[PDB]
Design an enzyme around this catalytic site. Structure first.
Site, PDB file in Angstrom:
ATOM      1  N   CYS A   1     135.704 -28.169  26.225  1.00 33.23           N
ATOM      2  CA  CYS A   1     134.469 -27.312  26.772  1.00 33.23           C
ATOM      3  C   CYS A   1     134.191 -27.996  28.144  1.00 33.23           C
ATOM      4  O   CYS A   1     134.762 -29.060  28.399  1.00 33.23           O
ATOM      5  CB  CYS A   1     133.326 -27.515  25.826  1.00 33.23           C
ATOM      6  SG  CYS A   1     133.513 -26.941  24.315  1.00 33.23           S
TER       7      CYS A   1
ATOM      8  N   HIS B   1     125.355 -27.881  25.920  1.00 29.88           N
ATOM      9  CA  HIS B   1     125.523 -28.323  24.408  1.00 29.88           C
ATOM     10  C   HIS B   1     126.220 -29.743  24.218  1.00 29.88           C
ATOM     11  O   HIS B   1     126.097 -30.150  23.047  1.00 29.88           O
ATOM     12  CB  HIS B   1     126.343 -27.063  23.538  1.00 29.88           C
ATOM     13  CG  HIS B   1     127.835 -27.151  23.829  1.00 29.88           C
ATOM     14  ND1 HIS B   1     128.630 -25.925  24.140  1.00 29.88           N
ATOM     15  CD2 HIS B   1     128.591 -28.054  23.550  1.00 29.88           C
ATOM     16  CE1 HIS B   1     129.694 -26.388  24.390  1.00 29.88           C
ATOM     17  NE2 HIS B   1     130.131 -27.368  24.021  1.00 29.88           N
TER      18      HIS B   1
ATOM     19  N   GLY C   1     137.190 -30.302  22.675  1.00 33.89           N
ATOM     20  CA  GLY C   1     137.000 -31.398  23.649  1.00 33.89           C
ATOM     21  C   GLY C   1     137.404 -30.537  24.876  1.00 33.89           C
ATOM     22  O   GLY C   1     137.326 -31.196  26.155  1.00 33.89           O
TER      23      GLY C   1
END
Ligand SMILES: O=C(NCCc1ccncc1)NC1CCCCC1
Ligand SMILES: O=C(NCCc1ccncc1)NC1CCCCC1
EC number: 3.4.19.12
Lengths: 304, 304
Positions: free
Chosen positions: B145, B41, B143
């Site tokens: 991820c 993503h 942030g």
């Protein structure tokens, strides 16, 4: 989102851990620059440990009786000295993994990470507080002595704790990195009782703010209180007194949540008077006191 | 002595964390050998995120649209591919700090350490379990991820989790390192509800054994039970069923404490039926289910 008991990343401290052997005692040392820090009781035969005279025991010890192993490579000891309850072993090689560091003596209520080590090797990391009776409630077995407590600020490791002792109550006692014990404890195999383990009030407040920030609000009440009224309640419940210094440090959490510190105090007061009634805050059925205001701001703002 | 929620030392995983930028999205990547693993993503514009077609979005992306920074040095991307929900970026430089590693898909109830990272930099480490509804209850901000979950066996890092998603309930969803989601979740900005968060029964038993090993015995009762009777109670209290496989894994804890597994089951049964009556076990006012039997044996035996 979510609030976890969180330790500093351990890599910078892992690169400092070595194994110190003197006679038949092996424990952990901290290698910073060309110096290895360890608990002086490394020189005791747990028959010495009953009433040791460290100066006298040290007379019988040379540089070469201190075996210092980093990974599986031996460090040459070119000097040794005693500073309070720690030995400083000068080695011939500066640790190439030395982080930027300071030695700091922390106050009761301050939190830190412990890298639990056995034979100079890390087994795990957890978050601790210096209890108001200057013990910590750690997880430490035989061979864990020399394991250190620390905080990190960006690139600088502040070393606040070295592990020395298990009290007969299974709580833990140790020194700053200058070898001064937190609290009244002595590196001696003698029954030593800890004082009252009071709740760190300022830390409970910070964790109630963390809970509000994360959506846990059920405990917020319609009351406020004063510093003096709140402290009467704190005293009754073996909570540390709250000072204006605690109120000041909580300012940013007050600011974000729009909840006055004394309002949160009145909410805590009702939690002490009424208990949790089988409810939880941030997945805990009791009031957590091992988050500082600094820890809440750090975790809630994603500081690295 | 003492029993702490303990994370694996984080140093080996810290040396693998990098920053991945694609367009205006920056998150964390895992650099192992000459491959950087991150959530796919990274390529979405949170307008894409509503119903992304990752294959289609990837057509518009070249090697040079993926910015990979390790410390503050840029890695050259010489290939990219999608495996399930992760991107694999081939870089021209093998990570010199690559530990021995495996990718493992864990089962619900298994524990692991998370190194929470922002901009390829570690902020903290905590211990987690894969909930039986295949969420984890982490601490993750924007942030985060690409932050990974892992176990260590001596020198070998087993990577079990990459962080992808925050559910609207503030619980956390992610993949194994092959990019397969734990549970039914999709990397899409769409309301996704989690199933029942049941208690990991086998882990509660292990933690009751840890408590017995550490001197906390008040909850031990005069009863035993059978697997079937216990499971009737487990069901009523949203506890996972106990199998013979759970009983087998608890054997060493049974062995040390001389407390038959089914006896400890009957003790848990009474704790479910009667609650804790304002008492604590290992400093907790509820029954902890994020220690595995393996975790108890490890911490109680000082494994490094
Ligand atoms: O030797 C000990 N404790 C003293 C060693 C120690 C030192 C610093 N922190 C924690 C522990 N326990 C033994 C273990 C096996 C079972 C019988 C008691
Ligand atoms: O953007 C978000 N969450 C989505 C980002 C995210 C991703 C993976 N894990 C956790 C969080 N929250 C914002 C933060 C500031 C306050 C308003 C909500």
């Amino acid at each position: 989102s979510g609030f976890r008991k969180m330790a500093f990343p351990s890599g910078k401290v892992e690169g400092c851990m070595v194994q110190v052997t003197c006679g038949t005692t092996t424990l952990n040392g901290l290698w910073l620059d060309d110096v290895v820090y360890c608990p002086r009781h490394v020189i005791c035969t747990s028959e010495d440990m009953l009433n040791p005279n460290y100066e006298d025991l040290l007379i019988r010890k040379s540089n070469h009786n201190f075996l210092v192993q980093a990974g599986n490579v031996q460090l040459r000891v070119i000097g040794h000295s005693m500073q309070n309850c720690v030995l400083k072993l000068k080695v011939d090689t500066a640790n190439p993994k030395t982080p930027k560091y300071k030695f700091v003596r922390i106050q009761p209520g301050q939190t830190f990470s412990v890298l639990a080590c056995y034979n100079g090797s890390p087994s795990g990391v957890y978050q601790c507080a210096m209890r108001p009776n200057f013990t910590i409630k750690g997880s430490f077995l035989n061979g864990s002595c020399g394991s250190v407590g620390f905080n990190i600020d960006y690139d600088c490791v502040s070393f606040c704790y070295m592990h020395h002792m298990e009290l007969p109550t299974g709580v833990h006692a140790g020194t700053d990195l200058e070898g001064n014990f937190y609290g009244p404890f002595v590196d001696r195999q003698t029954a030593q009782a800890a004082g009252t383990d009071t709740t760190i009030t300022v830390n409970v407040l910070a964790w109630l703010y963390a809970a509000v920030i994360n959506g846990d609000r059920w405990f917020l009440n319609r009351f406020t209180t004063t510093l003096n009224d709140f402290n009467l309640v704190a005293m009754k419940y073996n909570y540390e007194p709250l000072t204006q210094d605690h109120v000041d440090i909580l300012g940013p959490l007050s600011a974000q949540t729009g909840i006055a510190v004394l309002d949160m105090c009145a909410s805590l007061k009702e939690l002490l008077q009424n208990g949790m009634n089988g409810r939880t805050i941030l997945g805990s059925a009791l009031l957590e006191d091992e988050f500082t205001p600094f820890d809440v701001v750090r975790q809630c703002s994603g500081v690295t």
